Amino acid sequence: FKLKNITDSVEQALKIAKQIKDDLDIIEFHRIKLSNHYGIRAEEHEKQTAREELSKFSKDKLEADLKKLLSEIEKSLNAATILITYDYGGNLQSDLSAKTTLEALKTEVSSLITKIQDFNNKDHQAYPTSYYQTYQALRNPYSKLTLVKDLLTR
């Protein structure tokens, strides 16, 4: 029950984090077709497809996504404390590290929200691409939650 509580929330966090990461993939893919000077020549129709896809993404979508991710991380923390207090001669260090990584994620995701809200582009250009630090910061949560999941799966 308590284990399901923690692991269900982590799974919900993982899902949004994976989304963010996939969203970066989509934007990069189509942006490179639209780029006047970078990447491989695309046909006019790929370029038109790119404009329409890129219009599905905005600064607000990204902020909303991060706020949702942060909420699931904070429910993950809470569930982690319950599981932690519920000691049998000593806490598993797997449990401790999970909580530790989660605490790290929370500040890192909060920081990224504060960072992104002051971007000036409202369109897809609020999303950084790798062609840079922020690009990496945005997809780090998936890795760390992938470790949180791994640690609680015994």
Residue numbers in the entry: 269 to 354, 356 to 400, 404 to 426
Article passage:
B. miyamotoi encodes two separate bbk32 orthologs denoted fbpA and fbpB; however, the activities of these proteins are unknown. To better understand the observed differences in C1r recognition and inhibition properties, high-resolution X-ray crystallography structures were solved of the C1r-binding regions of B. miyamotoi FbpA and FbpB at 1.9Å and 2.1Å, respectively.
A structural overlay of FbpA-C, FbpB-Δ5C, and BBK32-C shows that the three proteins retain an overall similar structure around the conserved R248 residue (BBK32 numbering). However, we noted that the area near BBK32-K327 involves a minor structural alteration in FbpA-C and a more major alteration in FbpB-Δ5C. More strikingly, the structure of FbpB-Δ5C has a significantly altered secondary structure in this region when compared to both FbpA-C and BBK32-C. Specifically, FbpB-Δ5C shows a loss of secondary structure within alpha helix 5 that accommodates a loop insertion sequence (i.e., residues Q394-Q405), which are not conserved in both BBK32-C or FbpA-C. Furthermore, a proline residue (P397) in this sequence interrupts the alpha helical secondary structure in FbpB-Δ5C. A portion of this unique loop structure in FbpB has apparent increased disorder in the crystal structure, indicated by weak electron density surrounding residues 401-403 in this region of the protein. We have previously shown that residues on the fifth alpha helix of BBK32 interact with a non-active site loop on C1r known as the B-loop. Interestingly, although BBK32-K327 is not conserved in FbpB, this did not preclude high-affinity interaction with activated C1r-CCP2-SP. FbpB-C blocked complement activation but, surprisingly, was ~80-fold less potent than FbpA (IC50 = 1,900 nM) despite having similar high affinity for activated C1r-CCP2-SP. Unlike BBK32/FbpA, FbpB fails to interact with zymogen forms of human C1r but instead selectively binds and inhibits the activated form.
